[PDB]
Design a protein around this ligand. Structure first.
Ligand SMILES: CC(=O)N[C@@H]1[C@@H](O)[C@H](O)[C@@H](CO)O[C@@H]1O
Ligand SMILES: CC(=O)N[C@@H]1[C@@H](O)[C@H](O)[C@@H](CO)O[C@@H]1O
Ligand SMILES: CC(=O)N[C@@H]1[C@@H](O)[C@H](O)[C@@H](CO)O[C@@H]1O
Ligand SMILES: CC(=O)N[C@@H]1[C@@H](O)[C@H](O)[C@@H](CO)O[C@@H]1O
Ligand SMILES: CC(=O)N[C@@H]1[C@@H](O)[C@H](O)[C@@H](CO)O[C@@H]1O
Ligand SMILES: CC(=O)N[C@@H]1[C@@H](O)[C@H](O)[C@@H](CO)O[C@@H]1O
Ligand SMILES: CC(=O)N[C@@H]1[C@@H](O)[C@H](O)[C@@H](CO)O[C@H]1O
Ligand SMILES: CC(=O)N[C@@H]1[C@@H](O)[C@H](O)[C@@H](CO)O[C@H]1O
Lengths: 410, 4, 7, 406
């Protein structure tokens, strides 16, 4: 009995607490949980960017965050349970019970990490690191593994924090082909630390429509602070879903081999600020954008870039309303550690992301286009100023990663 | 990572 | 593109 | 007696007048004729028109004609087609090596790709043609002399020739000879034909082939089938961003070479520097590379007179009623012949399976000199093409594809 083909009655959730939410050719439910996840994405992204200086890059995987906190929700109760449901917009899947969310989440994960005879690799790993001394709830243990594949590995936080820390770090690294390293700095993890919950997500894809390295050239890129810098600009001409939306902003979709996952770029006209577009980027607008796209012939100028980012999510989430989970006095996670211990709370939550974009990904290729003549009045998309980037799974309308490229220069 |  | 994250 | 196996000593070349590695030097000679001729031809066309032709064909028809040339005519012929660069002391010896080359091009047990050639002579039925000339031509070029009544049925005769040509070109070359080029005075028509068909050693799948608007230089656009393929190919980006791409046919003995200038860079500059060595240079720098190839599914046809450019390149006597010296052709009848004109017609079709090319050259002795009948159509962003036999260093077909809409 595996969850990917299962019906809800085949998977008894038996959650300690339950919250009742108020008020195409894909699964209706996993599509709603998708709408939920994206709602969290743009709102969270809006906050994150507003707390950021305009000349800084931003990269993160909102799906990773939602998954990690959904894993945590499994043992949440009362108001900790409600805030989680509201903050992550799971409560917006009308009348559905908080327990149902996890079934849906598992269904969404099954599709996403298909592992079929595909061309792009999208992998995910989750895991629980509990102190060997503690005794975890049998149900929490079971469900975390059934719904999220998260296994529970015993570690010695009490005596060997440093050794435990290296074990975890080694694990994330391995599950991210080495792109996410020392997630846990030598400082954190002590003795008071009883549980380290972790989600990883890894993606690698090749362009369906090639950017020949031979065409890449240094070009000026215009930062928000009015100055310039030298970027490696990739170039090609060909058909791409595109659309010039409000106030001259250009939305472009670059698919990966398999067409299942794409890269979406949002480039405001030179006159307008990305901050202004960030502020107006509503979940419904973004969906509207994405749905109005149409195949077209254009010239593409896109820098090659590598972005590495990391930050604590605590403060951001608190502003959005996730307060109890972080308060040792208000936090209610009675479902996690078996036998009392009511005062378990999240001390901190960290996100670390990596993004590399270029030709061929990982030089040795070229492209020859013979006998082509395009309209001298073709649409051009020149990303030499700040723009937003998204990496999405189209059939599932899932935002896997998002960010902002304020500075691609070295 | 999340630290409980 | 190559991307990874951990939370 | 097989000229293909035989020593130069066995085959008695008894030409009237006179003036291994040899095969090779002949191929070089032909290659020089190809590029120089191509340039003159281009200078007479619109940088955006298609141009397709078989230089090998032309070299073959004019060599067949040289069997009966004398004096300056024999000399101008020897120089214009570069046979005079082959290390041989006599004009008559070149023909033996051209025969060897032709042997290697069309007579192999392998036969990965189909490459056939057919020559033939068409002389007026009332004349008595010189016997050795008839003999050497049938021996060296497999060219039999067919009787035709030019005296009382020029039109019937022309239609007869064009059709013979059509049968040797799988119907690809339908009209080598323009309507009024042959008349009551026509003494002889020398003809060459070449037919080729190869399969890509790496074919294109049609699913990957998609329509794409093609913008004509002046005006609007027309649809075009673009083929797509990804794979290892000998390639090379050279000076000024010009790409050289080799597409081998099954067997690897015959390949198609595409030459494309960089975007918004004129092809005319490359053509004006086109030369046998320049080409060898490009060919020598290609390295195997993983690459993506987009290439139109198309067909082009070129037809034209060759007198104008050939005169400009040096062949003047042969076209001069007064000066032409072709004493070896007619023994008794109506002699002191001159070429009234020469025609060529070529055809290239490219698709997912491979390529199909055919050509023909017809030299007309004492007919009505026509008036260069053009068929213009400006296109855009052309690229050069070449269908070569690698082992023999021979340019079979060469051209400029500019209209993929076809
Ligand atoms: C989610 C869950 O397992 N709840 C059960 C509850 O139904 C039962 O009444 C209690 C004692 O029998 O044990 C557990 O708390
Ligand atoms: C703090 C506490 O445990 N008291 C009650 C508890 O009886 C009830 O079950 C819970 C809802 O699940 O709401 C309250 O928190
Ligand atoms: C008159 C005659 O019939 N003899 C000629 C001979 O003089 C000439 O040298 C030769 C050319 O190779 O052609 C003929 O054989
Ligand atoms: C003008 C002319 O005919 N030049 C000579 C001719 O006199 C000579 O008899 C002949 C012998 O091969 O060679 C050249 O043709
Ligand atoms: C029907 C057909 O195609 N056959 C004809 C054949 O009769 C004729 O003798 C030849 C002349 O070159 O042309 C074609 O081969
Ligand atoms: C039939 C005739 O006119 N005789 C001549 C004769 O000199 C020789 O046989 C030949 C040389 O190639 O030229 C002509 O054939
Ligand atoms: C070991 C323990 O405390 N048992 C509880 C159990 O009473 C409850 O039914 C279940 C619901 O999630 O959670 C377990 O942790
Ligand atoms: C190829 C590579 O470097 N990836 C390795 C993988 O082979 C190995 O299975 C795993 C630990 O077992 O660690 C990964 O980082």
């Amino acid at each position: 009995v595996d969850i990917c083909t299962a019906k809800p009655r085949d998977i008894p959730m038996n959650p300690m607490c339950i919250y009742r939410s108020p008020e195409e050719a894909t699964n209706r439910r996993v599509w709603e949980l998708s709408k939920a996840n994206s709602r969290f994405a743009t709102t969270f992204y809006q906050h994150l960017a507003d707390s950021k200086n305009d000349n800084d890059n931003i990269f993160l995987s909102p799906l990773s965050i939602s998954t990690a906190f959904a894993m945590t929700k499994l043992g949440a109760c009362n108001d900790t349970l409600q805030q989680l449901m509201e903050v992550f917009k799971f409560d917006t899947i009308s009348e559905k019970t908080s327990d149902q969310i996890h079934f849906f989440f598992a269904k969404l994960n099954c599709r996403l990490y298909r592992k079929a005879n595909k061309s792009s690799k999208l992998v995910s790993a989750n895991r629980l690191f509990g102190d060997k001394s503690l005794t975890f709830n049998e149900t929490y243990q079971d469900i975390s593994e059934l719904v999220y594949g998260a296994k529970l590995q015993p570690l010695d936080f009490k005596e060997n924090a440093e050794q435990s820390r290296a074990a975890i770090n080694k694990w994330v690294s391995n599950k991210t082909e080495g792109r996410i390293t020392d997630v846990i700095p030598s400082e954190a993890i002590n003795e008071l630390t009883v549980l380290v919950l972790v989600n990883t997500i890894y993606f690698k894809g090749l362009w369906k429509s090639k950017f020949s390295p031979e065409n890449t050239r240094k070009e000026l890129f215009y930062k928000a602070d009015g100055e310039s810098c030298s970027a490696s600009m990739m170039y090609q001409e060909g058909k791409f879903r595109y659309r010039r939306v409000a106030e001259g902003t250009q939305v472009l979709e670059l698919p990966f081999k398999g067409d299942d996952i794409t890269m979406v770029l949002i480039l405001p006209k030179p006159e307008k600020s990305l901050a202004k577009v960030e502020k107006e980027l509503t979940p419904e607008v973004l969906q509207e954008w994405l749905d109005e796209l149409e195949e077209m012939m254009l010239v593409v100028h896109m820098p090659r870039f590598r972005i590495e980012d990391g930050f604590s999510l605590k403060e951001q989430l608190q502003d959005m309303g996730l307060v109890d989970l972080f308060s040792p006095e208000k936090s209610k996670l009675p479902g996690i550690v078996a036998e009392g211990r009511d005062d378990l709370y999240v001390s901190d939550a960290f996100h670390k992301a990596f993004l590399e974009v270029n030709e061929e990904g990982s030089a040795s290729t070229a492209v020859v286009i013979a006998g082509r003549s395009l309209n001298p009045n073709r649409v051009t998309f020149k990303a030499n100023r700040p723009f937003l980037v998204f990496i999405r799974e189209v059939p599932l309308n899932t935002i896997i990663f998002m960010g902002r490229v304020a500075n691609p220069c070295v | 990572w999340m630290d409980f | 593109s190559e991307a990874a994250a951990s939370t």
